[PDB]
């Protein structure tokens, strides 16, 4: 019963240290490639080392000591680190969800934000804000002695008043605010991806049917109008292919579309001349051009699906790692602030506090979702 926290923390230390070091390595390399998400992951990984370097002492506290032999300052410091780890992880997971949202929903509008320098400025603001919000006890020690004990390191059973109000603030602003933002980003991603995909099917069908008619057309007038709509579809698709960062794959798609449009023009003029051979000209040239870009298109579709998976898995991480803790923190605050599982709540609360340390494990996993 009482050995759950120590066992979970030992697991977390053993897994997170190798994996937070590898995560920092990988995120740095991603930054070298000008992937702005490598900055957020680096900020996440360092936060998870900062917490981990404190866990080895808590386990020893639970296994070998009857109290906090380190003194009140080691308790105020470990509390500060714990809270900053939780809110830093939430803030950076939210930042990731909001820049994947912007990347898919507004690929050419906020390009200046999808840059390493912008991500560093954002991380600097996030770090200063989190540190300030959780630094209050460092400027007045009554706060740490109105909230925490100084013979054991836990939050006092009853809550002074301001303690429960700050707990409600952190539940609503710390957890629920960025969580709601992550859910809105996820649905915005689903909508943007489903719309782009659906629009890219409308063009494929108009091209396919117009090619079929050209295949069976007799009068030059119908080949002409079929090519006219083929061209409109090709231009609309290239517009869909035009993105602000000039991704290498998109450049290739643009070149392919240019080749396609040139072939459509060659056929259109051959048809205006009145030579029936346009049927085979277009029926072979457009087929040959489509014969190779389809695999790239499939890779792009998979990429969009993997963004959806990132947003959903990231939400699941926030809801598994932190939901039980903010739920029992809110329940224990709604009690002080109002009028029986109550102690029974206090080891479900402590168990959920220990359970919140698995964000040191989830954070190095996101590496498999970005790339």
């Amino acid at each position, epitope marked *: 019963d009482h050995l759950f926290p120590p066992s979970l923390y030992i697991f977390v230390i053993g897994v997170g240290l190798p994996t937070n070091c590898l995560a920092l390595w990988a995120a740095y390399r991603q930054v070298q490639q000008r992937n702005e998400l490598g900055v957020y992951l680096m900020n996440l990984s360092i936060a998870d080392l900062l917490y981990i370097c404190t866990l080895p002492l808590w386990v020893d506290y639970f296994l070998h000591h009857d109290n906090w032999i380190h003194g009140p300052g080691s308790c105020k410091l470990f509390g500060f680190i714990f809270y900053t780890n939780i809110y830093i992880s939430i803030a950076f997971l939210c930042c990731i969800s909001v820049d994947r949202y912007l990347a898919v929903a507004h690929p050419l509008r906020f390009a200046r934000l999808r840059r390493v320098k912008t991500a560093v400025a954002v991380s600097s603001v996030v770090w200063a804000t989190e540190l300030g919000a959780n630094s209050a006890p460092l400027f007045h020690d009554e706060l740490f002695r109105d909230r925490y004990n100084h013979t054991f390191c836990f939050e006092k059973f009853p809550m002074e008043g301001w303690v429960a109000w700050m707990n409600l603030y952190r539940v609503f602003v710390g957890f629920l605010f960025p969580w709601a933002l992550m859910l809105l980003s996820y649905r915005g991603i689903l909508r943007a991806v489903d719309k782009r995909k659906a629009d890219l099917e409308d063009n494929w069908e108009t091209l396919n049917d117009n090619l079929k008619v050209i295949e069976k057309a007799d009068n030059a007038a119908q080949v002409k109008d079929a090519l006219t709509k083929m061209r409109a579809a090709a231009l609309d698709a290239q517009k869909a292919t035009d993105k602000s960062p000039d991704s290498p794959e998109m450049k290739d798609f643009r070149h392919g579309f240019d080749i396609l*449009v040139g072939q459509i023009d060659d056929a259109l003029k051959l048809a205006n001349e009145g030579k029936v051979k346009e049927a085979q000209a277009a029926a072979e040239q457009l087929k040959t051009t489509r014969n190779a870009y389809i695999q790239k298109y499939l890779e792009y579709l998979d990429g969009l699906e993997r963004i959806k998976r990132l947003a959903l898995s990231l939400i699941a991480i926030v809801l598994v790692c932190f939901a039980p803790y903010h739920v029992l923190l809110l329940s224990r605050s709604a009690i002080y602030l109002g009028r029986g599982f109550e102690e029974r709540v206090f080891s479900a609360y402590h168990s959920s506090l220990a359970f919140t340390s698995l964000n040191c494990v989830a954070d190095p996993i996101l590496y498999c979702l970005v790339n």
Partner: antibody
Framework: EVQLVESGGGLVQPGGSLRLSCAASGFNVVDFSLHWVRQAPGKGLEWVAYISSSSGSTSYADSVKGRFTISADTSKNTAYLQMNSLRAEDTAVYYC?????????????????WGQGTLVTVSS | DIQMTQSPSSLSASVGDRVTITCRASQSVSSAVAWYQQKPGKAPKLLIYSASSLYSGVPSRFSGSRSGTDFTLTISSLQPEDFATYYCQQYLYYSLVTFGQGTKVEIKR
């Protein structure tokens, strides 16, 4: 300097003919497609004819098919529109315009350069 | 055969006023609609190409956009120099070029 300069307009009797010219400066005739756009007095613009000397491709508006011939001679950097069997309905200001080739901006930018235009008046 | 229809064949507006000219394609046209400004006695000048972008040298007062087959030209604030006939033009292909009938912006009185 980028210029399109029309000449050769004037008065022709019905059934007669004119040869309009479009001289180019700055760019060559072979570097872009040339179009003739017509504007009858008091009317909007009508596309009339096209030539691309880089591919040997021409086309005409239905209203002038078999009546007008469009050609170009890049050695003088000049394009021509041969207007045969003219009808009263062909009275208009004829403008020469420059539209580039696909791919890219020269195509998306369409009639970027227009010449001054020349008047053809067909009357007995 | 791809007809374009401009709705406000004559539009009256004051200097400093907001002007919107709407043009409809008969069929799908990619963002291949250009807008031209013609003043009496002069060849048309290109304002907007690809249903959006300004041609270099054209004042920022001009803008436009596509919504499906509906294209618009907007003059955010008319200057004394903008009272001209504006034309909507479709450019899908060299041989398919068509123009709308044109809309004239008149000085309101």
């Amino acid at each position: 300097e980028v210029q399109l300069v029309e000449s050769g307009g004037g008065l022709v009797q019905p059934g007669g003919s004119l040869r309009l010219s479009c001289a180019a400066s700055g760019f060559n005739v072979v570097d872009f497609s040339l179009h003739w756009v017509r504007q009858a007095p008091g009317k909007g613009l009508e596309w009339v004819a096209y030539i691309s000397s880089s591919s040997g491709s021409t086309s005409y508006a239905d209203s002038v098919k078999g009546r007008f011939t469009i050609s170009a001679d890049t050695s003088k950097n000049t394009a021509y529109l041969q207007m045969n069997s003219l009808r009263a309905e062909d009275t208009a200001v004829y403008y020469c315009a420059r539209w580039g080739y696909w791919p890219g901006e020269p195509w998306w930018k369409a009639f970027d350069y227009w010449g001054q235009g020349t008047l053809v008046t067909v009357s007995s | 055969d791809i007809q374009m229809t401009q709705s406000p064949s004559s539009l009256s507006a004051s200097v400093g006023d907001r002007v919107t000219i709407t043009c409809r394609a008969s069929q799908s046209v990619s963002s291949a609609v250009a807008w031209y400004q013609q003043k009496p006695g002069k060849a048309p000048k290109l304002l907007i190409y690809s249903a959006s972008s300004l041609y270099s040298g054209v004042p920022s007062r001009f803008s436009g956009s596509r919504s499906g087959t509906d294209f618009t030209l907007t003059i955010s604030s008319l200057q004394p120099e903008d009272f001209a006939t504006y034309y909507c033009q479709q450019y899908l292909y060299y041989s398919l070029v068509t123009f709308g009938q044109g809309t004239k912006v008149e000085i309101k009185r």
